[PDB]
Amino acid sequence: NLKDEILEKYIPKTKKTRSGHIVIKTEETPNPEIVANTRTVPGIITARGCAYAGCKGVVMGPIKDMVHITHGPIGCSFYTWGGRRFKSKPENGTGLNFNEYVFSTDMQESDIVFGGVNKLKDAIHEAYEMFHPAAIGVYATCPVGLIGDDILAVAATASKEIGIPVHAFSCEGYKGVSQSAGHHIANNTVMTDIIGKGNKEQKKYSINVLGEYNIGGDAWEMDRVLEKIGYHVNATLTGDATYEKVQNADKADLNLVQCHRSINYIAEMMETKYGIPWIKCNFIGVDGIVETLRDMAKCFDDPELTKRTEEVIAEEIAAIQDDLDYFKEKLQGKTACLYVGGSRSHTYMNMLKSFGVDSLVAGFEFAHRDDYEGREVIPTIKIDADSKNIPEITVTPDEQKYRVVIPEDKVEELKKAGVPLSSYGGMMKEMHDGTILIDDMNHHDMEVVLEKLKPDMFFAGIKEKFVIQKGGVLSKQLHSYDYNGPYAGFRGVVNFGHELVNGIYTPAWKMITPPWK
C-alpha cells in the first residue's frame, strides 16, 4: 500500500517499469525479487552518476602515487577535485601524493573534430616529466569513444617511450546505466595489469581489505584495530593505496570485501588466479566489526591470534560503552530511512539497530540484484542491453603462484559455521518485516516516503540532504559523512553517534515556525 502510494503518480509506462524496483518485505515472501541495475527513466530526477565516476572517481582516484589524467573536457575533471573524501598521506611520510590535484587534457572543439590523441600524448609526457609517478591513468569521457580516439593505443606508445605503466580506461559516461559499469571497467584493468605484478615477499597473517576507500579516514581506523590483533594489511583497495602495494595484492591469505558491489569482480578473480579466498566483512557498527573479526580468526584458526582478537575487542568496547548507552538513550525508538550508493544503505543498518533506531526504508542507487537479494541469485541475473557492452574478463590459476590457502574440506565447515566465504547475503534479509526497498529512488518517491512514514532521520547524499531538511527532517550524509570521519571502526561508531545525536537535538528544528503563526 505504501508501494501503491508511491507508484500512484507515475504515468502508465513509468508506473509499469518502476513497480519492479519497489518491494515490500513480508514473512511469506521472505526472499522477494527486485528489479535493479536497469537504465534510469529519463526526467524522473535520479541521484545517479556515470561510468566515469565509478571508474576514475571511485576505484582508481584513491591510488595516491599514480597520476590520473581525465581525457575529456574540463568538468569530468573539476567535479572529481576533492568532493569524494578518500584520505591519503605520503607513504611512510615521504611517498608521492596527488590527492590535492586533478589532471586533464581540457579538450576543446578542435579536439572533438580533428581528434584528441595528440593532446593526450602530450599531456601524458608533460605529466611524466613533471611528476615522475609510479603510473599514469588515462580516463575516457563521453566524447572520447565517439570521436575515434584510441586511448589504449595512445597509452602503449607513450608508456613505451617513458618507462612506466600507462593505464587506459574506456569509462565513457554513457556506458552501463550508472557508476556500476565504471567499477567493473576499473576492476578488469586493475586485475590483469596491476595485481600480481608485484615482486615483494608475503608476510605472516597477510590480508587485504577490498572495496574500501578510506573516506574520512575509515580505513586507518580499520587498520589500527587490525594491527593490535596482529595482522599484516598487505593492501587496501584502494583507500590510501600506493601503486606498488596494489601490484602486491596477491601477497595475502584472506580478502575482506567491505563494498561488495565495487570490488567483488576482483575478489572472485583473485580466488581463481591465485587461490586466495574471501569473506564479506562489515567494519561498521560494533556488531558488524566484532562479527567480522570473529569470522577472520576462524579462517586463520589460531588459539593465540583468536585470543588476542577477543582481547582487543574487550578493551575497544570497554573504551566506548558509555557512549553507546548514551546514543541508545537519546535515539531509542527513532525511525530512519537510508538511501546510499550500492553498499552503505546496508552496512549502516546494524549500527542504527544498536542505537535502537528502526530502519523503515532502504535502497541502492546502482546496486544489482545480488546486493539486494544476495549472491545466490547470480545465476538468474540477465545482463540487459544497456550493460551488454561492459566487458567480462576471464582469469586462470597462475602456476608458479597459485595455492590452496584453505584446504577444501576446511572451507565447507567454516561455511557450515556461518562464515561468509565467497558469499554475501544481501541487504533484504537483514531488514525487518513490513519494511520496503526502493531501487534508484527518485525525488517523487522520497517525498511520498517522507509524507507517509515521517521518519525522524533520512540518510542519503548531498543532493537529497537539503531537500529533506527544508521539510524539517534531519538528513545526515553517508557518502561524505558531512565532512567528518571515521564513521567506520570502534572510534567511528562514537563519531557517528555523536554527530547523529547532535543533529537530532539541534534546537533550531523547533524554531521553524515564527511566533506570528
Binding site: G43, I44, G75, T105, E109, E126, C142, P143, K463
Partner: protein, 458 residues
C-alpha cells in the same frame, strides 16, 4: 601541502591542472534556476546533471534541482530524441514545472542531437501540456566555460520568450551576469533606490538563498516570472553587466525585439559601481538619491581609514573574467597591486582589460594569464610571494601551503556558511570586501608578530 608542485616552471601546453574554470552546463543550470517555476534539464548522460546539481548544493547549502535525459549507449547511436521525449512527459506529470529549460552536454553536442526538431515533434505529438513551456540552449562543454553556459542559456531565454508586443512597459532590463543571488538582490535594491523600474533576468535570489519554512518547496518563490521574461521585449533598454556572461543575451534581445543595450563592468569597486549608477541616472534622467551617495562616501572613508594596510600590497587573483576584471580594478583603486591575475575562461577581453588597467596605473611585471590555472599561480607565488590571495575555495590549499591571507570570492565557495547572504557588488559589497581583506591581513599580522609588537589598536 601541494608538495608535487615545483618552483621551476616548465610551461604546459597539454596538461591542465587544477583548473580556474568548470564546464558550460552548470552555468546554464544556474541561469535556468533564475526563472520562476523552472526545472533545468540536462540533455546528456546523467553524470553531468548530478555533478552540476551537486556543486550548486555545495556552494549554497541549498537544494538545486534538475532533470536529465540519462543517455545510454543506445542514444550514442540513435541520438537522444527518445530520451528527451520520455523525460518531458515524466517531468510535467511528476514535477509539474511551468517551464522546462533544456541545456546540452559534450555527449549530445558531439553526437549532433537536434533539440529544435525533438521539441517540434513534442509539440505536434501533444507532449507539452497547454500553459506549459519548453525552451533550450546548446552548451557544448568543450567550448568556453561555465560562464559561457550561463551566457548561452540567457540567449535561449531571449529566443523563446522575449516579445515586443509594441507596448511600453517603462522598464529597463538588467542582465546581472554570472553573480550570486546576494549580488542580484543588491543590484535590485539600487534600481529600487534610484526609483527605476526594471526586469532582471536571470534572477536566482529567492531560489538559491531561500528560507527554511518547514515545507520543502520544489519551485521556490523567486525567479524571474515567465510573464516578465516575455515582457522584456517591451523595455526601453538593456543593461548588460559583465560582457562574458551577459552581452550575448542583450545583443540577441536587440535583434529580436529592437531593445537597445549598454554594456557595463560587473559593478565591483568604486569606478565600476560609479559607472553603473551613472548609466542608470543618464538612461532615465533620475537623480542619485542621498542613501546611495552616503554608501559611496562610507566606502571612500573606509578606503582612506584602512589605507595603510593596503598600499603596495601584492595580490594574486583567480576566477571568472567579468568579476576578476572589476575586482582587479578595485584592487588598484585600493592602492594595492594585481600581481598575478588569472581566469580559466578563454577570450581576449580579459587580457586587454587587465593589461590596460595595469599599464594605466604604471604597474609593471604582473603576470596576466587567460586559460591559466591554480597550478600556474602557485608556481608564480613560489618564485615571488604575495600578500593576499583571492579565489574560490580551491585557493585554500595555496593559502595554507604559502601562508597567504585568503579571501573566498566568486564560484564555487563550498566551505563556509552564510557567505551567500553577502554581496560583493555595489558600494555595500565593496565595503564588505575591504573589511574582509583588511581583516585577513590583520589576523595574520597579529597571529605572527612578536608578543612585544602585539597591539591593542590597529
Amino acid at each position: 601541502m601541494l608538495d608535487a608542485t615545483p618552483k621551476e616552471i616548465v610551461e604546459r601546453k597539454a596538461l591542465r591542472i587544477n583548473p580556474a574554470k568548470t564546464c558550460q552546463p552548470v552555468g546554464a543550470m544556474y541561469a535556468a534556476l533564475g526563472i520562476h517555476n523552472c526545472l533545468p534539464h540536462s540533455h546528456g548522460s546523467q553524470g553531468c546533471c548530478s555533478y552540476h546539481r551537486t556543486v550548486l548544493s555545495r556552494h549554497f547549502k541549498e537544494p538545486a534541482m534538475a532533470s536529465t535525459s540519462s543517455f545510454t549507449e543506445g542514444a550514442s547511436v540513435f541520438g537522444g530524441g527518445s530520451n528527451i521525449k520520455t523525460a518531458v512527459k515524466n517531468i510535467f506529470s511528476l514535477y509539474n514545472p511551468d517551464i522546462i529549460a533544456v541545456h546540452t552536454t559534450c555527449l549530445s553536442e558531439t553526437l549532433g542531437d537536434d533539440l529544435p526538431t525533438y521539441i517540434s515533434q513534442m509539440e505536434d505529438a501533444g507532449s507539452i501540456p497547454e500553459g506549459k513551456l519548453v525552451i533550450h540552449t546548446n552548451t557544448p562543454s568543450y567550448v568556453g566555460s561555465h560562464v559561457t553556459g550561463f551566457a548561452n542559456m540567457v540567449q535561449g531565454i531571449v529566443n523563446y520568450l522575449s516579445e515586443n508586443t509594441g507596448a511600453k512597459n517603462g522598464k529597463i532590463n538588467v542582465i546581472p551576469g554570472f553573480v550570486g543571488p546576494a549580488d542580484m538582490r543588491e543590484i535590485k535594491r539600487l534600481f529600487e533606490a534610484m526609483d527605476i523600474p526594471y526586469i532582471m533576468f536571470p534572477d536566482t535570489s529567492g531560489v538559491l538563498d531561500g528560507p527554511t519554512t518547514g515545507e520543502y518547496k520544489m519551485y521556490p518563490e523567486g525567479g524571474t516570472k515567465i510573464e516578465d521574461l516575455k515582457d522584456t521585449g517591451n523595455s526601453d533598454l538593456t543593461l548588460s553587466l559583465g560582457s562574458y556572461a551577459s552581452d550575448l543575451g542583450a545583443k540577441t534581445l536587440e535583434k529580436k525585439c529592437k531593445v537597445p543595450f549598454k554594456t557595463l563592468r560587473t559593478p565591483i569597486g568604486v569606478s565600476a559601481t560609479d559607472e553603473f549608477i551613472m548609466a542608470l541616472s543618464e538612461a532615465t534622467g533620475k537623480e542619485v538619491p542621498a542613501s546611495i551617495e552616503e554608501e559611496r562616501g562610507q566606502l571612500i572613508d573606509l578606503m582612506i581609514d584602512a589605507q595603510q594596510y593596503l598600499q603596495g600590497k601584492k595580490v594574486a587573483l583567480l576566477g571568472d573574467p567579468d568579476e576578476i576584471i572589476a575586482l582587479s580594478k578595485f584592487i588598484i583603486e585600493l592602492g594595492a597591486i594585481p600581481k598575478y591575475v588569472v581566469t580559466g575562461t578563454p577570450g581576449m577581453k580579459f587580457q586587454k582589460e587587465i593589461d590596460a588597467m595595469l599599464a594605466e596605473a604604471g604597474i609593471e611585471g604582473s603576470k596576466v594569464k587567460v586559460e591559466g590555472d591554480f597550478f600556474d599561480v602557485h608556481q608564480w607565488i613560489k618564485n615571488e610571494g604575495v600578500d593576499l590571495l583571492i579565489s574560490n575555495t580551491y585557493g585554500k590549499f595555496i593559502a595554507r601551503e604559502e601562508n597567504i591571507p585568503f579571501v573566498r570570492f566568486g564560484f564555487p565557495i563550498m566551505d563556509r556558511y552564510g557567505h551567500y547572504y553577502n554581496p560583493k557588488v555595489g558600494y555595500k559589497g565593496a565595503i564588505r570586501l575591504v573589511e574582509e581583506i583588511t581583516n585577513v591581513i590583520l589576523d595574520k599580522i597579529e597571529r605572527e608578530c612578536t608578543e612585544e609588537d602585539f597591539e591593542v589598536v590597529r
